[PDB]
Amino acid sequence: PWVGPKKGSWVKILRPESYWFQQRGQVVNVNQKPEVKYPVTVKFDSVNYANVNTNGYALWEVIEAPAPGPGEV
Amino acid sequence: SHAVKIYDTCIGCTLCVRACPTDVLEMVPASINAAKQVASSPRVEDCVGCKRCETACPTDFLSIRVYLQDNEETQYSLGLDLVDWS
Amino acid sequence: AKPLEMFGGVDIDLEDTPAHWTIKASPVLEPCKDNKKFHKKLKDELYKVKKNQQKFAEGSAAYARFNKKIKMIELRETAYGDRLCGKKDGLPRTIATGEWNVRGSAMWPAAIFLYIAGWIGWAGRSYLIRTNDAAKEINIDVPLAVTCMASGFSWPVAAWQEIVNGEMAVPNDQIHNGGPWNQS
Amino acid sequence: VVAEAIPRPEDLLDSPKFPMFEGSTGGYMSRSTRERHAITWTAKGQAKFEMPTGGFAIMNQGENLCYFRKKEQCIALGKQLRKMKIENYKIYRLKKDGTVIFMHPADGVFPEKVNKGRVQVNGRPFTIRGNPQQSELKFTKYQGKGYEADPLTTMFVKARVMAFADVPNLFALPQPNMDELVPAEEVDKYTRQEYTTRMMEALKRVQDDRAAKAAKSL
Amino acid sequence: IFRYINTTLWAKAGHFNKALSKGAKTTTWIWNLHDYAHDFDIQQRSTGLIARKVFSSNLAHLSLVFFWISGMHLHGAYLSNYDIWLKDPKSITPSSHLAYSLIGQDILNSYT
Amino acid sequence: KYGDQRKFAAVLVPLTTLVFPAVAMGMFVLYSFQEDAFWRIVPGTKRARELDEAWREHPLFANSKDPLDGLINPDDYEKGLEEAWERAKPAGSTVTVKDKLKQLSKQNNPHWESWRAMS
Amino acid sequence: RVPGGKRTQELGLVIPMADEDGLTDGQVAGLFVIALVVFISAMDLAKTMYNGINPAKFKTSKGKGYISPLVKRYIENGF
Ligand code: CLA
Ligand code: CLA
Ligand code: CLA
Ligand SMILES: CC1=C(/C=C/C(C)=C/C=C/C(C)=C/C=C/C=C(C)/C=C/C=C(C)/C=C/C2=C(C)CCCC2(C)C)C(C)(C)CCC1
Ligand SMILES: CC1=C(/C=C/C(C)=C/C=C/C(C)=C\C=C\C=C(C)\C=C\C=C(C)\C=C\C2=C(C)CCCC2(C)C)C(C)(C)CCC1
Ligand code: SF4
Ligand code: SF4
């Protein structure tokens, strides 16, 4: 039984200290081990100050938002 | 001495350990990430405070955070060479 | 009781009529064509430029260019005659009361600039919306760029139609609000 | 792991373990400092390297030994050696008395390599934003050090933050009766377990009085 | 030999440095591109390219200095009062530099 | 005469702008080498420890530093928490409230206020 | 006096000086006595502020403390 958002599905970030808070990014993969605290891996078009466009988030920090659309983060 | 804390968001990069110039950080086994390892700071008394570990950390916000404490400086945290405090 | 001396020099209208709401009724100002300071300043300009002109040869090109400058100065003197200038400086003033019907009013330049500035901003926003990529910002898609630049003329209508139809703004819950201020 | 017998640098003049190095003014300042750090390693060929204190050096085909004032210089030289595929280098801190403390490969395994028996020191079990607010821990153990709070304290203050926003349902603390309480401390009735029963009954009386008073014009 | 002198890299800004190959993700990329422009040492390819770049850039700058000298010479021949200065240098200030009569800039030219 | 106050100045000005400042600077550099020097801002002074212990000896301020101070009946709070966790305990989970709180209180920060070891 | 500034010279502004003394030496000494009193009291206050409150006084100091009857009312009137 798959857990978390599907691969390639857009999710809105709910981590307040994240550089992409309330932004959206494609789900690269979700780790299926229940022991992993932050299994969801999300990649973004906008890099942060460390020039990193991907990060691993918790299961409770992604809400499966729709596609961004024209001129929308 | 400063205060170097490691948070759960660590993904076992080992980059923070490699970037530390005074061997403050080390890798310990854990079970909260796919790498089965998290960083630790057992020797922050040798932490000068260069924050290279924070530069090297790739998590969204640093899984390793160095808190500067200037009213706390020791001879090791200041990198004293000409002068000994022991 | 002589408001000039009561208030240390400044004078007050003392009359409550709508006909004095125009800038032209102000006692500080005066039409430039009948102001002594205006005459003296532009006469001094003419005198200085003419004195510079005599220093050169009669048949030189510099003499002709100074004649052209003198004609420009006299044209400026006659053109600013209807413009309002203060009764003590002689320098013509710019009207910023929204009069729309006085010499030197700021309404016409404001309207022109606001139109063209909205045009520039709308063209840039349209190009950014239609090129949702960083590669298109360093290597400009020139045909699309000039298409948006030409299309920007209808900004005062298209922008409002986007404002009311929910296509300009975005809810705060879709963009990064800012740094966290709490959690514990 | 067995610590070596690194002698004090002022007593090991002219040792065969010293690499051929040019020698500069950047070395440790004697006559003012007594704490020295020593790094030893075994090389395979006399490959030239750079001393952390200015000037270049040539290793020995066998054992090597260098003395430095700071651990940072020893670690810099250790990284430089490790770039040359030279492992098995150990860094010691020499106390003024001559005590040898084994520092860098503390458990014999380099810190970037996971080794069993290690425990996450200074670990915090939440995201960095999960730290409690500094304002909440005023005049407690963590007065200006909210990042040092144990996770139980963080959860407790988080629950307090959650609670102290539903203002209408809060319980105002009763005003103490200073004039008629407050006898000499020797004047007490003991019965500690009865004192909590007295707390229960007194607070029940206070709440009943408050409800009765509120149900007059509300 | 010269068949490799191609314009294909003109559009590809930042080609010379391998740290700029990731693309202009941020505005720092622009400043880095301008900063590494003449840093031939850190740019891509072997040491021979460093020598070629250094020598050819020296020649290009020398051409630039020659162009500046040529501009000064043409200003002196066609935009100057060097004739009357030759005839009477103690009464004529040197001037090979005019200003157009725009926005009243005519006030900058003075009697020489 | 309008002067005759300079008799006071010729003593006071040299005194308060030379003798007092020099004595103050010497006394300050002497005070800098006391074990009590700047005991309110400099960590690890003896007087700071004595003041903290004196505060802790007061009956009102005994359990003042505890962030969890306030629970009138901590046994009731713990019992209610245990009851609420029992109804929400996931399947055959083996964690109790008591040891969970005990291990959530015990963290590992050896280098926190280690300056309380010299004075 | 050698004046500076345009206005002093062009208006003739002058600075009169009393030919008398102002205050006699006795008055200055009378002021200095109270200044010394302020000085002693200020040194004492600086000492007290430097040392701060001593909570452990109830173990050694005599008496039993005192809360004024208005201070109790202010305690129980609220905050
Ligand atoms: C002729 C000389 C001159 C020059 C060189 C400038 C230069 C400038 N003006 Mg400007 N201005 C001038 C005359 C001039 N002004 C006159 C005569 C007026 C009338 C009083 C104004 C009124 C004016 C305003 C009201 C604003 C400027 C702004 C600006 C700056 C941004 C340029 C721009 O539009 O970017 C291109 C435009 C964009 C990238 C975004 C679009 C923004 C513009 C203002 C369109 C807004 C239209 C909107 C629907 C109506 C707004 C109503 C109200 C908020 C004013 C720029 C430095 C802006 C500024 O400084 O912002 C910090 C600004 O907001 N100007
Ligand atoms: C023969 C002279 C010469 C040569 C060949 C070089 C060559 C070099 N220098 Mg160098 N330098 C020189 C003189 C020279 N320099 C002088 C005189 C100074 C003292 C100021 C410096 C200070 C200097 C520093 C601090 C650095 C270099 C660096 C470099 C290297 C890369 C330069 C680069 O990419 O910049 C690209 C070119 C520019 C960014 C030019 C921008 C324009 C300048 C900065 C502003 C000039 C303003 C202008 C004069 C006024 C404008 C007019 C106004 C009215 C508008 C390159 C090897 C850099 C390096 O990494 O070396 C390896 C480096 O960090 N140089
Ligand atoms: C704000 C307080 C203050 C200040 C800044 C001054 C300033 C001055 N007084 Mg003075 N004075 C004051 C109060 C003050 N007076 C009072 C209240 C008296 C009456 C006792 C006098 C009696 C007095 C005499 C008799 C003479 C001066 C003189 C002087 C001058 C030389 C400084 C000196 O040696 O004074 C010495 C003055 C004293 C020792 C009296 C006590 C000084 C005050 C009360 C202490 C205030 C300190 C203040 C709280 C700052 C403390 C912190 C500091 C370390 C930064 C100088 C302009 C001399 C001079 O040349 O005048 C023309 C002089 O002959 N004063
Ligand atoms: C001609 C004319 C006109 C027109 C005009 C116009 C149209 C103009 C435009 C103009 C423009 C269009 C301009 C623009 C400008 C821009 C600018 C000028 C920019 C600037 C920038 C800056 C300033 C920067 C800033 C910053 C940042 C980046 C961020 C951070 C902060 C800071 C601030 C640093 C009119 C008719 C009216 C009148 C007559 C004359
Ligand atoms: C009349 C007059 C006056 C007054 C004025 C006023 C009072 C004004 C106001 C104004 C205002 C009160 C405004 C407001 C606004 C708000 C808002 C909210 C806005 C917004 C905007 C926007 C949103 C824009 C957008 C855009 C466009 C449209 C184009 C470009 C691009 C963009 C996107 C930017 C004066 C006194 C001066 C003088 C006389 C005349
Ligand atoms: S660099 Fe950051 S994420 Fe990587 S191991 Fe170190 S602390 Fe963890
Ligand atoms: S701040 Fe520097 S010395 Fe301290 S742990 Fe980080 S990298 Fe190591």
Q: Are F63 and D149 within 8 A, CB to CB?
A: no
Angle of CA points A38, A40, A44, to nearest 5°: 120
Q: Minimal CA–CA distance to D54: which of D69, D43, D36?
A: D69
Residue type, C3: P
In which element (H, E) is residue B4 found?
Answer: strand B3-7
- Residue D37 host element (H or E): strand D36-42
Return d(Cα D29, Cα D92) in angstroms, integer. 18
HSE at residue D6, side-chain half, CA atoms within 13 A, is 32
| Whole-number Cα distances in Å, E44 to C99, C106, E2, E38 | 64, 56, 19, 12
Q: In degrees, to the nearest 5, what angle opens at C-alpha F87 toward C-alphas F82 and F88? A: 95
Q: What residue type is assigned to position D26 of the chain?
A: G
- With CA atoms as reference, the chain E residue closest to A48 would be E26
The pair of three-digit structure tokens given for residue F8, joined into one six-digit string: 């006071």
From chain G, the residues in CB contact with F40 under 8 A are 52
Helix, strand or coil, per DSSP, at residue A29: strand
B24 lines ligand 7 (CB under 6 A): yes
Experimental approach was: cryo-EM
**Protein residues with CB under 6 Å of any ligand 1 atom:** C 106, 109-110, 113-114, 117-118, 120-121
Q: Locate G68 and state its tokens.
A: 């004024």
Task: For residue A5, give the nearest of A34, A33, A32 by alpha carbon.
Answer: A32
Tokens 């920007």 sit on residue: C152
The enclosing H or E element of C37 equals helix C36-54
- Nearest Cβ partner for D141 among F59, F67, F72: F67
Nearest CB to D127: which of B7, B38, B84? Answer: B7
Q: Residue D41 in contact with residue D88, Cβ under 8 Å?
A: yes
Cα(C126) to centroid(ligand 1), Å: 18
Atom index in ligand 4 nearest the CA of residue C110 equals 37
Query: Residue A37: CB partners within 8 Å, gap ≥ 6?
Result: A58, B8, B32, B33
Q: Is the CB of residue A15 less than 8 Å from the CB of residue B60?
A: yes
- The reply to whether residue A20 touches residue C176, judged by beta carbons under 8 angstroms, is yes
Tokens found for residue F25: 């600077």
Q: Could you count the other beta carbons within 10 Å of the beta carbon of residue C64?
A: 12
Tell me how far apart the alpha carbons of residues G69 and G59 are, in angstroms, rounded to a whole number: 24
Q: Which two tokens stand for residue E37?
A: 């422009």
Query: Letter for the amino acid at G49?
Result: M
Find the angle CA(D144)-CA(D150)-CA(D151) to the nearest 5 degrees.
120
Structure tokens at C119: 């045009």
Instruction: Give C7: exposed, middle or buried? Use CB within 10 Å, 0-12, 13-18, 19+.
Output: exposed
**Residue E46 buriedness (CB in 10 A; 0-12 / 13-18 / 19+):** exposed
- With the most atoms of ligand 2 within 8 angstroms of its CB, the residue from E30, E36, E39, E57 to mutate is E39
Instruction: Find tokens 């200065």 and name the residue.
Output: E85
Resolution of the experimentally solved model in angstroms:
2.7
Looking at beta carbons, which residues of chain E come within 8 Å of A47? 25-26
The whole-angstrom separation of Cα B16 and Cα B63 is 10
**Alpha-helical runs (H) found in B20-81:** 52-56, 75-78
B29-B34-B37 Cα angle (round to 5): 15
Token output for B54? 């924070």
Residues 6 or more apart whose Cβ sits within 8 Å of residue D72: B21, B22, B48, B79, D52
- Strand D123-124 to B3-7 pairing: parallel
* C117 CA from centroid of ligand 4 (Å): 9
Contacts of C60 (CB under 8 A, 6+ apart): none
Report residue F65 as tokens. 């530093």
Length of chain F: 119
